[PDB]
Amino acid sequence: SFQLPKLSYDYDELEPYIDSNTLSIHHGKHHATYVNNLNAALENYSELHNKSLEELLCNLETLPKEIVTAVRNNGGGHYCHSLFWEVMSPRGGGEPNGDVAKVIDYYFNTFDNLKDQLSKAAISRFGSGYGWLVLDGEELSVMSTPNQDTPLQEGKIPLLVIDVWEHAYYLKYQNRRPEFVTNWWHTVNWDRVNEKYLQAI
Amino acid sequence: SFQLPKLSYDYDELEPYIDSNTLSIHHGKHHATYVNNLNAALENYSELHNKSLEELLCNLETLPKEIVTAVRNNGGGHYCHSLFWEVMSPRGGGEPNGDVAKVIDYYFNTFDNLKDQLSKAAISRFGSGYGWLVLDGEELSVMSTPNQDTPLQEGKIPLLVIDVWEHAYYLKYQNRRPEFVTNWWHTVNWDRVNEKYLQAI
Ligand SMILES: [Mn+2]
Numbered sequence A, B: 001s002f003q004l005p006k007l008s009y010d011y012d013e014l015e016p017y018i019d020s021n022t023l024s025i026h027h028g029k030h031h032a033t034y035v036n037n038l039n040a041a042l043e044n045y046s047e048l049h050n051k052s053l054e055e056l057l058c059n060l061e062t063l064p065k066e067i068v069t070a071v072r073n074n075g076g077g078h079y080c081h082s083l084f085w086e087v088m089s090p091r092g093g094g095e096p097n098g099d100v101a102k103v104i105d106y107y108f109n110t111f112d113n114l115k116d117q118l119s120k121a122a123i124s125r126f127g128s129g130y131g132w133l134v135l136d137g138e139e140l141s142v143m144s145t146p147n148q149d150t151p152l153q154e155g156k157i158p159l160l161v162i163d164v165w166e167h168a169y170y171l172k173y174q175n176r177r178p179e180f181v182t183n184w185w186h187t188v189n190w191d192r193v194n195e196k197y198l199q200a201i
């Protein structure tokens, strides 16, 4: 039922920021595996077949105990990676544009300050996880999550995410997570972020 | 003044099971960083300068709140990597020997069954962490931990450990964690596992 989304670009089109082999494995093995495991967990619970990915991740307590973890982990993996691919682009980078640029300045004063704060949140996530920009009411804030956990469980709406699982960066950057994060800003699709923000409100 | 331990073997000596680049970075960068951050956290707390690593990690609940996470994470990293290196060897692999082989048969029926159980525990540890063989009273058992957490916390004594942080295996095995686990078995220093068992009594 859940499907692996096609990327908007080819596996070599985020070079040199993200290497081609990594993008192909990260999408075609890691993300594909979360989708397949999510579908396996839900196969035999047809009462859940019409839940959207968001509904599942917003209501994890109410699932059968046999599958809550599988849905948390693989549903999370599906959600997080799907957003990650959407917010990068072969012609991204630079400063925010559109309506969201304005709300960014409102809450962070400058874009450079947002970049500093999200970068710190991502680098400071110990072990596997993500850094996030979220809408919490009218407010923009930065946070991190462990593993494939998401902000939806907390009522916050993701606009932008960076994957700091070691698989996201180890082939090119090895232990140098901060160098990966510095490079990742060059890929950011501010057009798509602005679309996510409008959707959110 | 914790120190990075010397390996018992050169960086190319676990080939072809673990690549030399990985071994060099994993010991010389990752493990070194945990040691350096551990020493940095303890520097301002003179009370603690004579506590052993085992003491620190068995009594986290009592450290200053300003540094407990730093000690858990970096003390953990030094403990876990220090054991990881001593349980592998260029002479390792195969079926267990010595007294521990008899205790393995006693609790698992056969060694092949221990191997299945520990491999499963390592593979199923979602995110970053470790798989362990521990002594829990007189009884030996298999478990996993997240991040740089150890069984000491819980009163159990480590005899053997596998690192399943992605940094342990990504350069050679990428997403194929099961393949990495299969190869790691060819490295196991059963002499050292035996010594750790005898001491655990
Ligand atoms: Mn990922």
Ligand SMILES: [Mn+2]
Pocket: B026, B030, B081, B163, B165, B167, B168
């Ligand atoms: Mn490690």
